[PDB]
Design a protein around this nucleic acid. Structure first.
Ligand SMILES: Nc1ncnc2c1ncn2[C@@H]1O[C@H](COP(=O)(O)OP(=O)(O)OP(=O)(O)O)[C@@H](O)[C@H]1O
Ligand SMILES: Nc1ncnc2c1ncn2[C@@H]1O[C@H](COP(=O)(O)OP(=O)(O)OP(=O)(O)O)[C@@H](O)[C@H]1O
Ligand SMILES: [K+]
Ligand SMILES: [K+]
Ligand SMILES: [K+]
Ligand SMILES: [K+]
Ligand SMILES: [K+]
Ligand SMILES: [K+]
Ligand SMILES: [K+]
Ligand SMILES: [K+]
Ligand SMILES: [K+]
Ligand SMILES: [K+]
Ligand SMILES: [K+]
Ligand SMILES: [K+]
Ligand SMILES: [K+]
Ligand SMILES: [K+]
Ligand SMILES: [K+]
Ligand SMILES: [K+]
Ligand SMILES: [K+]
Ligand SMILES: [K+]
Ligand SMILES: [K+]
Ligand SMILES: [K+]
Ligand SMILES: [K+]
Ligand SMILES: [K+]
Ligand SMILES: [K+]
Ligand SMILES: [K+]
Ligand SMILES: [K+]
Ligand SMILES: [K+]
Ligand SMILES: [K+]
Ligand SMILES: [K+]
Ligand SMILES: [K+]
Ligand SMILES: [K+]
Ligand SMILES: [K+]
Ligand SMILES: [K+]
Ligand SMILES: [K+]
Ligand SMILES: [K+]
Ligand SMILES: [K+]
Ligand SMILES: [K+]
Ligand SMILES: [Mg+2]
Ligand SMILES: [Mg+2]
Ligand SMILES: [Mg+2]
Ligand SMILES: [Mg+2]
Ligand SMILES: [Mg+2]
Ligand SMILES: [Mg+2]
Ligand SMILES: [Mg+2]
Ligand SMILES: [Mg+2]
Ligand SMILES: [Mg+2]
Ligand SMILES: [Mg+2]
Ligand SMILES: [Mg+2]
Ligand SMILES: [Mg+2]
Ligand SMILES: [Mg+2]
Ligand SMILES: [Mg+2]
Ligand SMILES: [Mg+2]
Ligand SMILES: [Mg+2]
Ligand SMILES: [Mg+2]
Ligand SMILES: [Mg+2]
Ligand SMILES: [Mg+2]
Ligand SMILES: [Mg+2]
Ligand SMILES: [Mg+2]
Ligand SMILES: [Mg+2]
Ligand SMILES: [Mg+2]
Ligand SMILES: [Mg+2]
Ligand SMILES: [Mg+2]
Ligand SMILES: [Mg+2]
Ligand SMILES: [Mg+2]
Ligand SMILES: [Mg+2]
Ligand SMILES: [Mg+2]
Ligand SMILES: [Mg+2]
Ligand SMILES: [Mg+2]
Ligand SMILES: [Zn+2]
Lengths: 534, 48
RNA sequence: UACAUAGCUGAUUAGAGGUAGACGCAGAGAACUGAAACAUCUUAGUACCUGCAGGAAGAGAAAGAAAAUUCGAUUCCCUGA
RNA sequence: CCUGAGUACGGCGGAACACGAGAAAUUCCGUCGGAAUCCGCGGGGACCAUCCCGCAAGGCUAAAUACUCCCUAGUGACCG
RNA sequence: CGAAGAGACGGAGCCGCAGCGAAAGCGAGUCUGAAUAGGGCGAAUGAGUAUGUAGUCGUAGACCCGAAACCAUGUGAUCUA
RNA sequence: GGUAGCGGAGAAAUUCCAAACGAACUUGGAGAUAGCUGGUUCUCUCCGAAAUAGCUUUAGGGCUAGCCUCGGAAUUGAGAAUGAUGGAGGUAGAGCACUGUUUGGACUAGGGGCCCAUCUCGGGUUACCGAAUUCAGAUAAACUCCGAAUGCCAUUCAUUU
RNA sequence: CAAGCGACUGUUUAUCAAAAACACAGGUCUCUGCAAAAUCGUAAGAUGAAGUAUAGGGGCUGACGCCUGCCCGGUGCUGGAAGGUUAAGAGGAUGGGUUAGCUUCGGCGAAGCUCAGAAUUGAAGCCCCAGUAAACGGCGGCCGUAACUAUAACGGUCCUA
RNA sequence: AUUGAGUGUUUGUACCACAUGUACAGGAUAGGUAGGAGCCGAUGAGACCGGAACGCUAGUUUCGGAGGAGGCGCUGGUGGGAUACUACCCUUGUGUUAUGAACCCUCUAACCCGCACCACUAAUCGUGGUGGGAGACAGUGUCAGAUGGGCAGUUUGACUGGGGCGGUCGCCUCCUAAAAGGUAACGGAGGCGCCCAAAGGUUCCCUCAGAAUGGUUGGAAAUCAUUCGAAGAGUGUAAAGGCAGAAGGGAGCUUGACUGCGAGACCUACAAGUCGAGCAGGGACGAAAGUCGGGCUUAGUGAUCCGGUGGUUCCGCAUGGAA
RNA sequence: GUGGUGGCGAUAGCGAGAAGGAUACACCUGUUCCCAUGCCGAACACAGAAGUUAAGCUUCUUAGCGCCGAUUGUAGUGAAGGGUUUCCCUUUGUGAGAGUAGGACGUCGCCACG
RNA sequence: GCGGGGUGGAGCAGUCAGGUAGCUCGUCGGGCUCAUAACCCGAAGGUCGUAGGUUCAAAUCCUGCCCCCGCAACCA
RNA sequence: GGAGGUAUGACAA
């Protein structure tokens, strides 16, 4: 994998400018960058989906296994088995091959030569992708991540975010690829599932490029780290792990900063003398002469003076509730719920939040965490029981899959609210790193991370006193995650949160944790680890 | 940022026209129906 | 230093310098100058210095010129320009 | 069986070719690497194929050419 | 060849007799162009060439005299350090 | 006796190196270059400038054009002067109809202090300051409702040339 | 009699300057372990020295007396050397030209030759880190404040190595 | 390069030995392909016992002991694949060799010795010889990076009421400018180095700024109504000239901000600059007439050389290609 | 007479006042129809004929405003001179602006209905 | 004419690189102390010199204008 | 028991 003089500019905002990178074979490259840096765009160039405006991107002829950052569900009714089977081209070629046989009967002596060649290649190609895979896939689920066979016959759209991530990861492996391009392979996975992915990627003999915002996950796998710079629009490739990249990078920016400082001092020195000559008496001929001579040096200095790159601005969040929390924000009493045709997730679930409380809904993948939160908002109507919100409680919901954005509309149109004027909307979007005409961009072209900021901005603009957050740090760059956690910690309201990120929950400082599926309203503590083990 | 651009013929790929656009007001590639002297017919032209 | 060799003595043999302030070949090689300035370039491979010459020197008998199809070592003059 | 090897040639650095490295063939110098050999080798202005022309890495060779310190006999819309 | 002459021989070559086009190429046309269009340059609408002579120019010191200087061989410490 | 010029020597002054040393002397390149100054030699006849524009590392240099001269070709005579006729153009003057500058008078929204009334709410005054309006009177390179004389362009025009 | 400058005797612009200039003994810094450093020279060969750190070269200061404060951010020098950057060379993955052969105008295309060539490797230097001022050098502003006034020992604040 | 021996350590490569192959089903640990009805054994078989390795924990592999002769496969079902055994091999991890390299040190014959002794020999030169030292370094050649006023060749505007300082340098508009045009000053004033996807084209439609009067929030002044109002507005951006038969304003459709050009003019030293009817191709708007080769007009720009990119019925140094 | 449509610099206009509708022109009556309003059948568009001349519109009166404007005189100025020469004067030609006498409430066509 | 400056009572940030007006000391009110200082807790004090532009929005960018401070305003 | 040693605060009253 090699790229030369890479250039790419969507409209007015550019991604790569004379960027270059060379990746040796059998390199587990960790791709790192802030949201919008252009990590996903690099893969699209490798997959030939995009074309560079200028430059050459060179890829090996080997087959590439691509794990998209977003799940591709062509139709809502697609079953999990159909989704996985689409990984291999067995079905596609057979449909083509079946038609070829039809043409052979219709056509006698005209197209036979072309048809015979096409038939031969399909058979040879089909045997290369041995048609025995029908059995292998069924057992690849078992050995991979303990994916139950009940899911195997279930529509994919109905799976949980963590479950979908397992299926998509398995689909990539099912294709039997030669190069692995993984775009956040552990976005929704829980702690247990992440262990399997790490071990497989450690053992994987071939080249694997990983886009991840999980530092610990990368450090265990990465041997080479590729950093996509958001301000310089370039690519830099280091040898080592994430910390080594940070150490090398921090030093380089330090050494660059010191260079610009000394160049400024020399410019100021000349400038100071030029001014002294400029204001001297016209009768001081020699000083006036020297002043002009130094004016020439001053001009040449100012033209070779390196510009310091503008440091990328970090998110600023100030979430405050309009009204005040009550001692009983939310009352859940004897609530039972089941998805039609599936086992009851919980029976007679009853809990009561206290107010200005950090409430963590713990669990594992596919256990009902997101179902419970959907239950409170009203998306799901409880099969039994009641859910009562005090009239003093305003609720803000952050869905797991980013289902609150209109892909067709722009960023500004999405955040449009009756309670906020135009300049107020722009100011907050700038605090979320959407500057100037970046807010007129369609939501359909944004990255998952940038979309997450828009959803967060919607939550912030509500000024609600109860925050139902379902995996908030997902898709966010590591810097933005820490900002999110720190600001929530200071939030003066009740927080119902779900998070598989150990760092994020620690920053928020959880008070009570609700374990699933075994309902257990418990005081928060390192006993969370005990529940995870059991 | 007003810039100079070329409008290529989407049929024959002849770079037929020199014009300019403001990238801020026209992020996407300018498309116009312009006469192609090669094909001697009006064809869709797109910035390249 | 053993045989030797070097050294040493004699004989033999041949150079040693000068020019014609020209002409030839070779080594080494400026600058003013021109470029309307100036570093590439130009003045020049010129002046100067040094070596070797010879009555001439140098080159010369195709691992060539060509592609009218062919020519048949080199040198010099006209032309090509 | 023989027909010129540390040669031809190549990289690097210079130079000579009207040709200033240029797309630069041809010739040479320094440095390093370094062939084939008649079913071979070189050239035909990068390079390859084909065709054509030649046969390097050994030497010699008169004449037609340059010049005149001197010698002999002369010449001049040359000096006086 | 011939008096250091005229002259004779010598047609290689040079200019002129056709232009147009970057060029392939076409040709009293040709190039541009899709164009029988328009337009450019040509033909229509012919005079050249050799030599002498004079004017001017170019390359040469180029109408004559004049720098401070630059470069390259040599000569000087009998003055003076 | 030693040190020699791309150098030497210097208790150091750009000091000395054969009577002038920021770099000796001599010969050569060499007739260096000199957009600079000086000089450039017989006669008569015909004609006769320029000291301007543009560009210029250009400004006391140069180049093209303008102006001089010589020769040549050719046309419904294309030049000049004057007259007649027809046009373009806004200067002199003048004017104020616009825009600036400006004087007085009348009247005035509004604007300053005083009292009564003060919740600072409504008045009555300096012949207190006065917009705008109006009356009269000025002013203008970058003002114009106007506008010459001249000059200029033109005419198959007329006369002389 | 007294003041400046230079300690002193000396030295200098032969030929407009004899001095306060140079030199000087003394001081200090630094280099130099000897085929020394330094210098003349393409080199050989020399000086240094037939010397050897109490010696030799270089910079600055300039008898003697009392003294010589602060700043190592910058520039030099010295040391460091993990990392970043970095030549030739080495290495050559891939891509072009050609064409035996394949070929469904297409085009494909082995070998050899040939035109380019990325990864990788690659020293010092530089970036960096520290030291060093008898190394180069540099050694600040504004506001307030006392039993009269004035000032202001004192206070605030900013800037700097 | 001269420049040659080794050792050791870490590494790249290629063979060579060994060992590894457990998805589910299935006799159970079938790695791929081909051949395969036969294969192995007193050259001591199966079974038994013990050690060892792997391990997915099922078993697999190997060594040795005792014993002495028999076993495996085909046939059979499972599965995508069926098994003995051989061959060609591919994954996996141990060793050996062939080894390319980096380092490590060691060695000694090159090379070096302004060390000693010996000879040539009168000689503190030199050359040999012998010891000692050093040593494949150093030195030297070629190449490459760094450093390098130690030294060298040079550059280091012009205008200018002297020169300097300051100002200016190209383009647009005005006044100066003397009613055509042109016209200078380091004269007086301002702008430009763009902008616009409509703020372009066309079709249709529209008319301004202010003022008075009335009117909730509402104020001098935001929106509304009437009347008056010839331009006192606007015309993207300076000024002048122009435009409300709009060149100003709105709306629909559009891309003529077309291609080839171009009689004839203006301007002009040149190079350039400006206008242009009209012709053809193919269009936009419009019923049609017709308008449209950008924008009210005039600034918004830079020769050549040299490079980039796209196209091309051009050329292609013997020829076809290529360069 | 009225309604169309033109040429001529508003001497054609403006303001004020008066009269008229037979036709014609308009107000006018409607939104079913094509079509229309960044809202509104106001407009545009279409269909229609109860009423009205009230307005527009035509004709007429008025110069109050705007417009046009001779002559005379003057400013300036071409040419030729002059002085007492930043200015000023004479001669000869030319000749405004201003201010005025005055003009003017239009004129010349073509078509249709009367 | 060449520069530097105008942000709460003073001294400073923020200004390059547009979104949200602060820090230091001081002032005022309340505490603590017998009292004062120091200390603790609360509050106040500017729409950024001023007026137009650019923008969705300016203290910030642009332009003008008025103020304050160091220089200069002429050389043989 | 004994001995040498290891922040601020008028003046008079
Ligand atoms: N619309 C649905 N229809 C049918 N079944 C559903 C539906 N949604 C969820 N389920 C099932 O509910 C179970 C748990 O629901 P839920 O979406 O809350 O999982 P979860 O807690 O969010 O897990 P995670 O977020 O880690 O992936 C899943 O097994 C899932 O298959
Ligand atoms: N068609 C597009 N049009 C306009 N902008 C685009 C378009 N496609 C991408 N961008 C921009 O490219 C930028 C970077 O591309 P990309 O989506 O790959 O970022 P990313 O690093 O992968 O995001 P994340 O890490 O959060 O998943 C995005 O900010 C996105 O807004
Ligand atoms: K001679
Ligand atoms: K020269
Ligand atoms: K010159
Ligand atoms: K010879
Ligand atoms: K060459
Ligand atoms: K040849
Ligand atoms: K030949
Ligand atoms: K023609
Ligand atoms: K033609
Ligand atoms: K003749
Ligand atoms: K002649
Ligand atoms: K001459
Ligand atoms: K001459
Ligand atoms: K002497
Ligand atoms: K002396
Ligand atoms: K002439
Ligand atoms: K006026
Ligand atoms: K005037
Ligand atoms: K002295
Ligand atoms: K002294
Ligand atoms: K002293
Ligand atoms: K003296
Ligand atoms: K002296
Ligand atoms: K002292
Ligand atoms: K010393
Ligand atoms: K010193
Ligand atoms: K001393
Ligand atoms: K320092
Ligand atoms: K330092
Ligand atoms: K090939
Ligand atoms: K060596
Ligand atoms: K003067
Ligand atoms: K339009
Ligand atoms: K109506
Ligand atoms: K009426
Ligand atoms: K009238
Ligand atoms: Mg992404
Ligand atoms: Mg979930
Ligand atoms: Mg020159
Ligand atoms: Mg040459
Ligand atoms: Mg060759
Ligand atoms: Mg060579
Ligand atoms: Mg032959
Ligand atoms: Mg001969
Ligand atoms: Mg001598
Ligand atoms: Mg002597
Ligand atoms: Mg001096
Ligand atoms: Mg002398
Ligand atoms: Mg010469
Ligand atoms: Mg005369
Ligand atoms: Mg006047
Ligand atoms: Mg003295
Ligand atoms: Mg004395
Ligand atoms: Mg003297
Ligand atoms: Mg004297
Ligand atoms: Mg001193
Ligand atoms: Mg020595
Ligand atoms: Mg110099
Ligand atoms: Mg020179
Ligand atoms: Mg000058
Ligand atoms: Mg002056
Ligand atoms: Mg005039
Ligand atoms: Mg004029
Ligand atoms: Mg317009
Ligand atoms: Mg060819
Ligand atoms: Mg050839
Ligand atoms: Mg008049
Ligand atoms: Zn086309």
């Amino acid at each position: 994998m090699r790229g030369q003089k890479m250039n790419l500019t969507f409209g007015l905002e550019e991604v790569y400018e004379d960027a270059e990178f060379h990746l040796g074979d059998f390199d587990k490259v960790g791709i790192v960058g802030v949201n919008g840096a252009g990590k996903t765009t690099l893969f699209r160039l490798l997959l030939r989906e995009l074309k560079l405006d200028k430059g050459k991107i060179t890829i090996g002829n080997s087959r590439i296994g691509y794990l998209p950052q977003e799940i591709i569900i062509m139709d809502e009714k697609m079953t999990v088995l159909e989704f996985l089977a689409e990984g291999r081209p067995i079905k596609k070629m057979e449909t083509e091959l079946n038609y070829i046989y039809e043409k052979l009967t219709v056509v006698d002596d005209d197209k036979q030569d072309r048809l015979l060649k096409r038939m031969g290649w399909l058979q040879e190609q089909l045997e290369y992708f041995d048609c025995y895979e029908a059995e292998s896939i069924l057992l690849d689920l078992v050995d991979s991540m303990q994916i139950d066979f009940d899911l195997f016959d279930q529509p994919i759209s109905e799976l949980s975010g963590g479950q979908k991530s397992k299926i998509s990861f398995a689909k990539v492996l099912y294709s039997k690829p030669e190069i692995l391009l993984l775009d956040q392979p552990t976005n929704h996975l829980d702690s247990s599932t992440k262990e399997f992915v790490t071990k497989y990627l450690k053992s994987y003999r071939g080249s694997v490029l990983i886009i991840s915002h999980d530092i610990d996950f990368l450090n265990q796998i990465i041997d080479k780290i590729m950093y996509i710079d958001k301000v310089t629009h370039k690519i830099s490739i280091y040898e080592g792990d994430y910390y080594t990249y940070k150490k090398k990078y921090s030093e380089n920016q330090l050494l660059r900063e010191k260079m610009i400082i000394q160049q400024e001092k020399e410019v100021k020195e000349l400038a100071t003398f030029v001014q002294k000559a400029k204001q001297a008496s016209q009768t001081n001929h020699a000083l006036k002469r020297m002043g002009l001579e130094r004016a020439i040096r001053l001009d040449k200095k100012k033209k070779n003076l390196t510009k310091r790159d503008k440091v990328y601005k970090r998110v600023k969040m100030d979430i405050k509730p309009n009204r005040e929390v009550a001692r009983t924000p939310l009352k859940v009493e004897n609530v039972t719920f089941h998805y039609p045709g599936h086992p009851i997730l919980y029976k007679d679930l009853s809990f009561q939040i206290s107010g200005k409380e950090r409430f963590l809904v713990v669990g594992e993948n596919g256990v009902g965490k997101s179902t419970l939160l959907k239950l409170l908002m009203g998306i799901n109507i409880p099969d039994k029981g009641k859910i009562i919100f005090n009239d003093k409680t305003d609720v803000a919901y952050y869905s797991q899959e980013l289902e609150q954005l209109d892909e067709e509309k722009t960023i500004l149109e999405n955040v449009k609210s009756d309670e906020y004027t135009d300049w107020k909307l722009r100011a907050t979007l700038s605090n979320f790193l959407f500057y100037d005409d970046d807010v007129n961009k369609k939501v359909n072209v944004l990255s998952p991370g940038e979309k997450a900021r828009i959803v967060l901005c919607k939550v912030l603009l509500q000024k609600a006193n109860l925050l139902i957050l379902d995996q908030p740090t997902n898709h966010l760059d590591p810097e933005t995650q820490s900002i999110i956690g720190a600001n929530f910690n200071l939030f003066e309201g009740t927080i119902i949160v779900v998070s598989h990120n150990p760092s994020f929950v620690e920053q928020i400082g959880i008070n009570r944790m609700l374990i699933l599926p075994s309902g257990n309203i418990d005081n928060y503590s390192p006993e969370l680890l005990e529940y995870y083990s059991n | 940022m007003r810039v100079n651009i070329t409008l290529e013929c989407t049929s024959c790929k002849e770079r037929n026209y020199l014009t300019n656009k403001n990238k801020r007001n026209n992020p996407d590639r300018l498309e116009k129906q312009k006469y192609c002297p090669r094909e001697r017919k009006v064809t869709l032209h797109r910035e390249t």
